[PDB]
């Protein structure tokens, strides 16, 4: 049975590689504190305080907390991530299991200056999953508070909150309030455990590979085309130079002129920034020159935006202003961190199919030329979908997110999340957890006011998550060797992806998925 003196689960951290499948399992130790002193609170921000209109909000913070494993380093060790990206053309999630076990509730009393902590054996926690998607879904915004990448670390559970419609700092009639105690929930004492299972819906494999061809090079280099293009509008001669028409076939020496079947993907142009700072304009342009969208009178940066190549050839010092993912190095500051404290990703691989984020999409015609008027052209800085476009998605990273919830709407176009990962109409459900309030002694004459005098408590336990992943094997006939992700050979003060002398785990660099190649 389950009692005070027996454990309700075991520690599972493992990975198993079987054929076309890999199964990861992770266990961590968590600590859960009481939030808001058991209260729900209205929160808002408005111009009155001095915020700009672009930052206003209205919402609620709750006493509850939630579990989040939406980063890949929750499930994969760095060596496992190497096995995946060097050997496979793609992967996708299939199913998951979740367990919550070995739960301990503790009470802390304050007397004079000294603080003491004891067990409370009869207290509970409450847990439920939102399986019908009835709550605002705050997973998928890339918040802090996921399970730690390193299995020995103990993490704090984050507080749940949400936003609803606002006008300035005020609410409107359509604004919704939610009470989370209004769902069914399971209550657990120190001997109880909790578990559920979930199945992923069909989703396309993430493409982990780069193309070894480019979209404008798909032709046979040895042969002419049978089609023709207009090669000459004027006679080339001694003196006159009158109007003429002349035509040529496309061939090996004019590839720019040949007829083609396909177009590069869409473009929304970003401003370019150099990591060599003396090359930048001297001014503070991050917001005023930023790439933005405009919704209901608010301006919001398109960050990272649609997938575009970070730079062209030999340009690596440049990046789009708001167009890339940027991670932190360990102990990086929250505000105004220096360039040496952060890690910049590069989407450079998709340069074959996708326009570079800092250039125009192309050129079109402005006017109607004639004998009287010379022709004029114009530059295309944003281009939506054209028939014949092909494109790649943004890459995924070991530090980065896995899935997002597709918003429930009448229509969408190519619902792949812009921060990267798998779009899901029915994502893995969110998991809510709370300490049950325990009153301090009531008065001995009746009073109708709600009791707000409590014994301070927190809880701890273990959590397990297990995901099964499907693999897509690499079939290539390429003769020469591939690029692989590898560790450095040379000696160093510390080992990458390990602890230091102080005990702190760190991740030296971001690692994407695209190493193997494939024909376009």
């Amino acid at each position, epitope marked *: 049975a389950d009692g005070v003196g027996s454990s309700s689960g075991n520690w599972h951290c493992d990975s198993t590689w079987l054929g076309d499948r890999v199964i990861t399992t992770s266990t961590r130790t968590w600590a859960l504190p009481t939030y808001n002193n058991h209260l729900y609170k209205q929160i808002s921000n408005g111009t009155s305080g001095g915020a700009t209109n672009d930052n206003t909000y209205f919402g609620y913070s709750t006493p509850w907390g939630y579990f989040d494993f939406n980063r890949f380093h929750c499930h994969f060790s760095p060596r496992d991530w190497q096995r995946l990206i060097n050997n496979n053309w793609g992967f996708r999630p299939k199913r998951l299991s979740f367990k919550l076990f070995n739960i301990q509730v503790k009470e802390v009393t*304050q007397n004079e200056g000294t603080k003491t902590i004891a067990n409370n054996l009869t207290s509970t926690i409450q847990v439920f999953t939102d399986s019908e998607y009835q709550l605002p879904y705050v997973l998928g915004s890339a918040h802090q508070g996921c399970l730690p990448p390193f299995p020995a670390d103990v993490f704090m559970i984050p507080q749940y909150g949400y936003l609803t419609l606002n006008n300035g700092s005020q609410a409107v009639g359509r604004s919704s309030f939610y009470c989370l105690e209004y769902f069914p929930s399971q209550m657990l004492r120190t001997g109880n455990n909790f578990q559920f299972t979930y199945t992923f819906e069909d989703v396309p494999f993430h493409s982990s590979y780069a193309h070894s061809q480019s979209l404008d090079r798909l032709m046979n280099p040895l042969i002419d085309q049978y089609l023709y293009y207009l090669s000459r509008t004027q006679t080339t001669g001694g003196t006159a130079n009158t109007q003429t028409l002349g035509f040529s076939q496309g061939g090996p020496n004019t590839m720019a002129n040949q007829a083609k079947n396909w177009l590069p993907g869409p473009c929304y142009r970003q401003q370019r920034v150099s990591t060599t700072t003396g090359q930048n304009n001297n001014s503070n342009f991050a917001w005023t020159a930023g790439t933005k969208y405009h919704l209901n009178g608010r301006n919001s940066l398109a960050n990272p935006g649609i997938a575009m190549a970070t730079h062209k050839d030999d340009e690596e010092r440049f990046f789009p202003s708001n167009g890339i993912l940027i991670f932190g190095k360990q102990n990086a500051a929250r505000d105004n961190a220096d360039y040496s404290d952060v890690m910049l990703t590069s989407e450079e691989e998709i340069k074959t199919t996708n326009p570079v984020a800092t250039e125009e999409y192309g050129i079109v015609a402005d006017n109607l030329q004639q004998q009287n008027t010379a022709p004029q052209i114009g530059t295309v800085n944003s281009q939506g979908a054209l028939p014949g476009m092909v494109w790649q998605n943004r890459d995924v990273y070991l530090q980065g997110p896995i899935w997002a919830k597709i918003p429930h709407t009448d229509g969408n176009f190519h619902p792949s999340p812009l921060m990267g990962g798998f779009g899901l109409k029915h994502p893995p459900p969110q998991i809510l957890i709370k300490n049950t309030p325990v009153p301090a002694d009531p008065p001995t004459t009746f009073n109708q006011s709600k009791l*707000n*005098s409590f014994i301070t408590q927190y809880s701890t336990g273990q959590v397990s998550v297990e995901i099964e992943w499907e693999l897509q094997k690499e079939n290539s006939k390429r003769w020469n060797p591939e690029i692989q992700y590898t560790s450095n050979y040379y000696k160093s003060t510390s080992v990458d992806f390990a602890v230091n002398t102080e005990g702190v785990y760190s991740e030296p660099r971001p690692i994407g998925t695209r190493y193997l190649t494939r024909n376009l």
Partner: nanobody, 125 residues
Framework: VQIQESGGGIVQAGGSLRLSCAASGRTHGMYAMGWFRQAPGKEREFVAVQDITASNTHYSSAVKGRFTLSRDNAKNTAYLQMNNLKPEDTAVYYC???????????????????WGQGTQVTVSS
């Protein structure tokens, strides 16, 4: 939701001084009412706190055995009576209020929403 100090003054050592505090509105607020003090050039220190029903009460170690905290819900006020005063009790006392009383966290300033202007109490020997 204004808290307001009263009863400030200067006293010789051993005298009995009485600080008072009042609020306006939200009797569904002001659940917990208490006192802090900040001496010259020093950190703010929690002095006392009591809840609405008078069931739960706490005094600071230095404060205990000399001060008593009392409360009148009708007037929506709270009083602090002070006995056997020592000149290290010169400080600026703040009435403080909050929606909740916790057993671990009550002595932290993080748990109080509202703060008065303060009072100056001087104690001489």
């Amino acid at each position: 939701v204004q808290i307001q100090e009263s009863g400030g003054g200067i006293v010789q050592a051993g005298g009995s001084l009485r600080l008072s505090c009042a609020a306006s509105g939200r009797t569904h607020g002001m659940y917990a009412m208490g006192w802090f003090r900040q001496a010259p050039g020093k950190e703010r220190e929690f002095v006392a706190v009591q809840d609405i029903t008078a069931s739960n009460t706490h005094y600071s170690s230095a404060v205990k055995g000399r001060f008593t905290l009392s409360r009148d819900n009708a007037k929506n006020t709270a009083y602090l009576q002070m006995n056997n005063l020592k000149p290290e009790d010169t400080a600026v006392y703040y009435c403080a209020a909050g929606p909740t009383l916790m057993s671990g966290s009550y002595n932290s300033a993080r748990d109080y929403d509202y703060w008065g202007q303060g009072t100056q109490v001087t104690v001489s020997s």
